[PDB]
Design a protein around this ligand. Sequence first.
Ligand SMILES: OC[C@H]1O[C@H](OC[C@H]2O[C@H](OC[C@H]3O[C@H](OC[C@H]4O[C@H](OC[C@H]5O[C@@H](O)[C@H](O)[C@@H](O)[C@@H]5O)[C@H](O)[C@@H](O)[C@@H]4O)[C@H](O)[C@@H](O)[C@@H]3O)[C@H](O)[C@@H](O)[C@@H]2O)[C@H](O)[C@@H](O)[C@@H]1O
Ligand SMILES: OC[C@H]1O[C@H](OC[C@H]2O[C@H](OC[C@H]3O[C@H](O)[C@H](O)[C@@H](O)[C@@H]3O)[C@H](O)[C@@H](O)[C@@H]2O)[C@H](O)[C@@H](O)[C@@H]1O
Ligand SMILES: OC[C@H]1O[C@H](O[C@H]2[C@H](O)[C@@H](O)[C@@H](O)O[C@@H]2CO)[C@H](O)[C@@H](O)[C@@H]1O
Ligand SMILES: OC[C@H]1O[C@@H](O)[C@H](O)[C@@H](O)[C@@H]1O
Ligand SMILES: OC[C@H]1O[C@@H](O)[C@H](O)[C@@H](O)[C@@H]1O
Ligand SMILES: OC[C@H]1O[C@H](O)[C@H](O)[C@@H](O)[C@@H]1O
Ligand SMILES: [Ca+2]
Ligand SMILES: [Ca+2]
Ligand SMILES: [Ca+2]
Ligand SMILES: [Mg+2]
Ligand SMILES: [Mg+2]
Ligand SMILES: [Mg+2]
Ligand SMILES: [Mg+2]
Ligand SMILES: [Mg+2]
Ligand SMILES: [Mg+2]
Ligand SMILES: [Mg+2]
Ligand SMILES: [Mg+2]
Ligand SMILES: [Mg+2]
Ligand SMILES: [Mg+2]
Ligand SMILES: [Mg+2]
Ligand SMILES: [Mg+2]
Ligand SMILES: [Mg+2]
Ligand SMILES: [Mg+2]
Ligand SMILES: [Mg+2]
Ligand SMILES: [Mg+2]
Ligand SMILES: [Mg+2]
Ligand code: NI
Ligand code: NI
Ligand code: NI
Lengths: 458, 1247
Amino acid sequence: MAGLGNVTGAVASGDSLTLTLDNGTSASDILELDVLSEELLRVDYRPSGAAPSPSTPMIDPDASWDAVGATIDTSGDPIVVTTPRMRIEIARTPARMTIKKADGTTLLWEPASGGVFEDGVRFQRGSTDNIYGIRSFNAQEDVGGLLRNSSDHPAHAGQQGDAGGPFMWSTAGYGVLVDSDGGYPYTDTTGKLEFYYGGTPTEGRRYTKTNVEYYIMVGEPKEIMASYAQVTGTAPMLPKWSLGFMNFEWGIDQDELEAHVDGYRARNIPIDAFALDYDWMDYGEDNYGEFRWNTDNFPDAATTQLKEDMEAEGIRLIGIRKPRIITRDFANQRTQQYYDADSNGYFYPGHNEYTDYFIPVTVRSFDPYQQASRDWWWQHSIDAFDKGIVGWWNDETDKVDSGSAQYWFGNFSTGFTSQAMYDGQRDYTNDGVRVWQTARSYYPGAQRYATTLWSGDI
Amino acid sequence: MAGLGNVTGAVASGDSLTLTLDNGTSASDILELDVLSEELLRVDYRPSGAAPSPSTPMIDPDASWDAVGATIDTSGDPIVVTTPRMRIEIARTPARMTIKKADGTTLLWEPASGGVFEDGVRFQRGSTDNIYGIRSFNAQEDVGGLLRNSSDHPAHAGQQGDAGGPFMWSTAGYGVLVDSDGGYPYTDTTGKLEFYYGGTPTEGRRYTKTNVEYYIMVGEPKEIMASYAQVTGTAPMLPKWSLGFMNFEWGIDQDELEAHVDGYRARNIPIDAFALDYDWMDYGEDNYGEFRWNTDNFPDAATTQLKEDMEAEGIRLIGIRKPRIITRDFANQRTQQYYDADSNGYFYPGHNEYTDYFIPVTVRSFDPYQQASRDWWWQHSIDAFDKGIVGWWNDETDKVDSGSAQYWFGNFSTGFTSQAMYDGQRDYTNDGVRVWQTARSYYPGAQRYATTLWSGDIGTQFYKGELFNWAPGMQEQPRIMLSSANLGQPKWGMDTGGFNSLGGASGPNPSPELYTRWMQFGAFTPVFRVHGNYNQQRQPWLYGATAEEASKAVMHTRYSLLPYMYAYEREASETGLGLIKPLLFDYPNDPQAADYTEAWMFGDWLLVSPVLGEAQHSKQIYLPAGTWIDYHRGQTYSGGQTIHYPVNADTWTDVPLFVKQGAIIPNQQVLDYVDQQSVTTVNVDIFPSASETSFTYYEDDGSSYDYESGSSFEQRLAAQDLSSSVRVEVGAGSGSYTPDVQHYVLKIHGRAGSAVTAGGSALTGYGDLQALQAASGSGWASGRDIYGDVTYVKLPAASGSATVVEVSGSAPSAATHAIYEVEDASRSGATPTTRAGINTNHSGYSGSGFVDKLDVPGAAVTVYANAPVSGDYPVELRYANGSGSAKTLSVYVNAARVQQLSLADTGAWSQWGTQTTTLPLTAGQNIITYKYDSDAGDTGGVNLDYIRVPFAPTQAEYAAESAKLWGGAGTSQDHWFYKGAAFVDNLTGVGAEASFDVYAPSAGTYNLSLRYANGTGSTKTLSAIVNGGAASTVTLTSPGMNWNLWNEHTMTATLTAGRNTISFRRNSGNSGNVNLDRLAVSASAITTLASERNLLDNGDFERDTTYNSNWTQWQPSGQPSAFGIDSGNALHPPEGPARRNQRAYFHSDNAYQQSIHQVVDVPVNNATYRLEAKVRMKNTTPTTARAEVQGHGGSPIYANISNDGVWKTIVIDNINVTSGSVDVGFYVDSPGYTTLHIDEVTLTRAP
Ligand SMILES: OC[C@H]1O[C@H](OC[C@H]2O[C@H](OC[C@H]3O[C@H](OC[C@H]4O[C@H](OC[C@H]5O[C@@H](O)[C@H](O)[C@@H](O)[C@@H]5O)[C@H](O)[C@@H](O)[C@@H]4O)[C@H](O)[C@@H](O)[C@@H]3O)[C@H](O)[C@@H](O)[C@@H]2O)[C@H](O)[C@@H](O)[C@@H]1O
Ligand SMILES: OC[C@H]1O[C@H](OC[C@H]2O[C@H](OC[C@H]3O[C@H](O)[C@H](O)[C@@H](O)[C@@H]3O)[C@H](O)[C@@H](O)[C@@H]2O)[C@H](O)[C@@H](O)[C@@H]1O
Ligand SMILES: OC[C@H]1O[C@H](O[C@H]2[C@H](O)[C@@H](O)[C@@H](O)O[C@@H]2CO)[C@H](O)[C@@H](O)[C@@H]1O
Ligand SMILES: OC[C@H]1O[C@@H](O)[C@H](O)[C@@H](O)[C@@H]1O
Ligand SMILES: OC[C@H]1O[C@@H](O)[C@H](O)[C@@H](O)[C@@H]1O
Ligand SMILES: OC[C@H]1O[C@H](O)[C@H](O)[C@@H](O)[C@@H]1O
Ligand SMILES: [Ca+2]
Ligand SMILES: [Ca+2]
Ligand SMILES: [Ca+2]
Ligand SMILES: [Mg+2]
Ligand SMILES: [Mg+2]
Ligand SMILES: [Mg+2]
Ligand SMILES: [Mg+2]
Ligand SMILES: [Mg+2]
Ligand SMILES: [Mg+2]
Ligand SMILES: [Mg+2]
Ligand SMILES: [Mg+2]
Ligand SMILES: [Mg+2]
Ligand SMILES: [Mg+2]
Ligand SMILES: [Mg+2]
Ligand SMILES: [Mg+2]
Ligand SMILES: [Mg+2]
Ligand SMILES: [Mg+2]
Ligand SMILES: [Mg+2]
Ligand SMILES: [Mg+2]
Ligand SMILES: [Mg+2]
Ligand code: NI
Ligand code: NI
Ligand code: NI
């Protein structure tokens, strides 16, 4: 957790400056500065001069910049790097960076206490500076503001609409971007602006870095953002239809889709796309069913016909994808896609197969406390009894746990459910067929209605 | 919490002892002891001697004991009950029970501090006694032992194998059983043995007891247990086969069952039964599927064959039962079982519909991090792509939660999943088809692979905690969007309408209000999309006519802006900056922009601030440095301030949108979809600033990556306001793509030139925009629009050289009206091939044509017309009618049917006429529709040429509820007969005020009329302050002690040109205590406003249902009301209102009669009135269903309502009122299930 030592060597060449820093050993630390643009500096700290690790997929591998022709003056203390847009000062003893505008305004700096080190970057800046980036908010979180002035939330992709990254910037005229697979940005109102690799995040870490590769941006917000896009990549242009209105829908087939499109077109309500949920594909089936059009829902997707008729009406189709495959189909048989993925090693590391559900059913609890309800429940069971159900396995007379639904049945629910079958069967068979039942709860009195108890999902 | 008082009486009789206990009062406590057996005592404590409540189902209702012949000695202290097995002592002062064995050993006793009491029993016993009972353990719990020596666990049935009850006993020789529905047993190692009813337990309580009924057992454990069974019941004998082995199984059919049984039998492994899980029944299906044998799994269960064949092999069958029914079948239809349960009330109380799953599959996550894995993933996607999947909605690349499965995907999973599709599609199509994707996470770098971000499973609610706390709602979304933009992912969207509700998929859709506001918001975000949960619908027409029309209108604005928006899509490919940004991007040094999210930039030149509040009448909007022009209303605002912005809560037509001075905004005709046709004229709206600004117009093929190697087109447009001219440069064309655009029409706002020059040549002047558009070759024209003076300049696009245009001079138009050629407007109809049409097959039309095909029911044309202020606008319709007689069309304004127009024959189809109708327009955008509404009795059958809308109304109105309220002034709906969505009240404290922003075309004296209520009984006062001038007194008389009466206060005011402030305030000397509704303003004498014609209170049922109205209801004595008011958003699909948010309904599952009625005193007696309403009926044909008018001085007038399922208009005209009042009503006589919806009821004075 210590800062860099003294500078023992400074080699300038073009837009690059390489500093050798004393660390007490024969393997000195290396710090490589590269002026990428007039307002963008790449810093690569290599502890004990070890080779850098590969950059994570944050970094655009095709990124390149024109020569800047920065001035690099190693003649004194501090060493000075200048462009028309920024002035970088590296003090020699110990090595500490200060970043300034070309006009001399101090933006951020590595404090005496310590700056870059083997596990992150540490800067100090104006305590009233407004900080942005780092994180957003997901569909299960309290939603804060834009400001990140007292932030310790990790840098992650997150889930459920979240966004994040090791990118922290200010309207005071600077940004910091660290190449990293997750990690821990930190800010506070004393002026700290830091980033730590830390321990393995919740989401895992598959790209480890021995070096610390980071970028310093100078400029107004749009300039910072443009520099961010130079480092991590610009966005390819989407199809122009993607500026139009889109109707996403779960629970839809071809006839419904046609009626919806007709409803929009009849009303001159513009629309360019429908997105189809599970409905579009044979999810759950063998032979890559989770990639295949569901022709029960969409008969004309047996060929290019659906595509072409929808295109003729100005509708493009989007389809939902899940990054998983069905490994046992509806009939519990191993699928072709399982064998192919298993033999080639295509499953996500640490993720084992799991039983899952995707076909929702709507239900609602009956009330066994009412005689008329019990009479009804029994009446509708007679046919099943006649055709061989002679024992009643009464499950879930205790509590529902389904999504937002946490509903308790009352203490007499087992007794009364049991009573419905007991009274009914005894009446129907004129006391000629003994009743047998089981339930997974018991309260005094339930035993009058011929029920056993089983110990649940052990 | 105190113990019993002194025994004051003791009556022994047989095996019973009845004690009377002192409690201070004349109604003494009763304690009944009954010796049931030699070792079983019943105790019944009845506070104040009240009758006991019924015993819970714990108690065997048939329990019965032989006489014991116990000895009861009341002669001393203690009283003594003995049997051969126990000795019960009751001390007299205070009453305390001690229980002993016959031999005198003390088992337990009530301590001095208190025993039995109103909410339980309290005993003391040996501290080393071992206690048993109370509770067991479930399949999700740590499992303890048998001892209950330090227990505070509740007595409950519990879940998942639990057992429990108010039964505590000891091997030291005693037991205690309390009759109770749940409760709280307590033991500790000091010797306490207690039971409390307590509050309602987690599981609920449906059996409440005012008495305390309990039982004391004496004996060894088997004797205690036998006594327990005497009280609560013995167990009937199970079938003998139930002592055998049973194989329970889930995932089984008849073939497998037979194989299993053969397996047992072949090996002589005994077995008596198989239990069948979901497999046995048609769970999920209609017609009681959850009670019916599944004959796909078990074919021989079609008859008794399966039962009989299995019985022959010695196998009995057990079937799983769930205490619930399926309420929706696999095609989302209500089930028979639902209808039966719902109508009879058989659902568990407090348990609503919810989502279950019963069909499992097994899945496993793929690794997108590997190139070989990505190749495989793409290869298997090709067939779906060929057959129409051209966009990839990549879900759950973040985290999965499935049981024990809590698996995280790594930070690069969205990027790499996107790369699989991106690299793949680009290779397969040879860079010929652009990639589109969306994911629900973002991490830096993912943007390289062409993916947007959506905000995940957000809640269908206005804000987090409105309806539920576990997901954010609409109001949080701008903060999520702008946080994403701050991370370099500006390509963002949300589930407009929301995804999650209480109850899951079966839970409610958004209200029409929530839906409409969300659509207006979404139209100004990058990825514009609706979504909802399983089997939910998000089509705009389902949410009523306001949602439909407001959504359509804002969608037209977005699509008109395609050329503007598309330049930002290109910009994102060069710098990553996109279509939206927070204000802080442009204003890094502004502290009021630092955390600002209620407004944002849409491109460089538009600031948008959608109305996101429920029932919001006004908005505070921060405008940063510059000059801003209201897009819809035309007025200018100086920057660097928070403005008060009135909005119309009644129409929902406002989307607050501000043009940044400097703006250069390319726009086009509205297409149904992006490449519906070539667009050859692009409009460029220019609002020049004193500094030069520019916008680079951009085209390419919209479809491929050809743009990457130069195949695109751009032209830099630049503008500057100079000392006495405006200069606009259209730079030379650039790039190799040949664009569709042939001409720009520059619309240069703020100057109506006398000359327009270019290259030492003065351009040819034309009479107006239409003449200019029809001319070949360049030219100019001038006019007036909502913003003021405008100069039009038509020039060729894509020239090889730059053109500099200069507009000089000032010659303002004399025009009094804007003209909208209806052939340029929005044409609709019942189906895609029956929309209103365009034609030129009769002569004499203005513009390029006229609108025909208004002769198929439902055909319509809709004009979007801006108004600077709310008020009366006489709108002229030009039409032809060569039919030989009058024809009718409906005119709708902001989704309200304003009038049926009677359009006279004009002599021939090539001869044209005009009809002028005063329309109630609101400030900003208005939706004006001419429609053949056959369900309102229109004929249709005319051709329409244009409408002319005056730039100024005849008189203006300003809603008090939308004014700037201060000093405690607030909005309310808690009195009747207000106009608009509300009124203003609480003008009580000194300083309370409502301040109106009133606009005037010129300096002068204007008439004001202030609508107010004063039900104090006496005259009250406020002060009027105009432009901060000297206060004048406003004296406001009272009609009497009645806050449902409104009056006009008329006055004059000197106003200046432009914006004026007119405040009504309780100054120090004023009394206040009046309610304010609306301020009318006119240069002429003020008359009845077009928006205020309706004489009914709450005729549209839009009032918050917490507050009542002048509507009354009736049903037969003893029948529940079948009437309510709501939005219809809880239904799937929604059955929405005719307009705005709410509609009345009549519905019952049983036979019913129901009416609503409203009586009003009319303004002018001995005159003619007219009743109009929207009505919709479905389900069973009722015997009677009608609108009714009565009490008017004539006999009742009826109009029948006809069972369709569609909204129709019912009209009762020519109501001759001579009584001074009218009763309007709606009545249904149904055999059951008939649903009537009623909305938009109006009673108006009829010409
Ligand atoms: O309205 C539909 C849903 O929408 C949102 O979720 C979107 C989500 O939908 C799909 O996944 C649904 C859920 O699937 C799994 O959990 C399902 C249940 O698993 C267990 O129970 C299984 C069965 O066990 C038997 O023994 C029992 O007899 C039977 O009744 C029971 O169903 C759990 O014990 C239950 O509690 C679960 O309900 C996942 O584990 C869940 O995370 C998931 O919500 C779809 O496949 C997904 O891709 C998609 O993301 C709402 O959030 C959701 O509540 C709602 O149902
Ligand atoms: O309804 C108003 C309408 O009246 C005239 O047009 C009538 C009619 O003219 C066209 O149809 C003519 C004719 O076509 C076929 O022969 C059918 O079999 C006939 O029933 C039909 O009458 C036109 O196609 C129709 O749209 C139209 O209703 C005026 O000429 C119209 O301008 C005016 O809108
Ligand atoms: O329970 C009040 C409810 O009644 C109506 O909804 C009916 C619907 O009209 C019927 O067609 C059928 O689907 O059953 C529903 C009863 O739940 C009203 O339309 C609705 O507003 C109201 O809430
Ligand atoms: O019906 C499927 C499963 O449902 C659970 O609630 C029961 O406890 C199990 O015994 C049963 O196999
Ligand atoms: O596939 C069903 C649902 O799954 C959820 O994980 C997604 O976030 C929803 O958008 C989708 O509708
Ligand atoms: O002004 C509103 C009031 O009007 C009538 O007096 C009603 O009886 C009352 O319930 C209501 O609150
Ligand atoms: Ca015309
Ligand atoms: Ca009002
Ligand atoms: Ca309404
Ligand atoms: Mg370089
Ligand atoms: Mg390290
Ligand atoms: Mg601060
Ligand atoms: Mg659907
Ligand atoms: Mg079709
Ligand atoms: Mg198939
Ligand atoms: Mg293997
Ligand atoms: Mg007796
Ligand atoms: Mg009580
Ligand atoms: Mg002990
Ligand atoms: Mg099996
Ligand atoms: Mg056999
Ligand atoms: Mg069947
Ligand atoms: Mg009902
Ligand atoms: Mg305000
Ligand atoms: Mg009041
Ligand atoms: Mg009255
Ligand atoms: Ni997060
Ligand atoms: Ni328990
Ligand atoms: Ni009903």
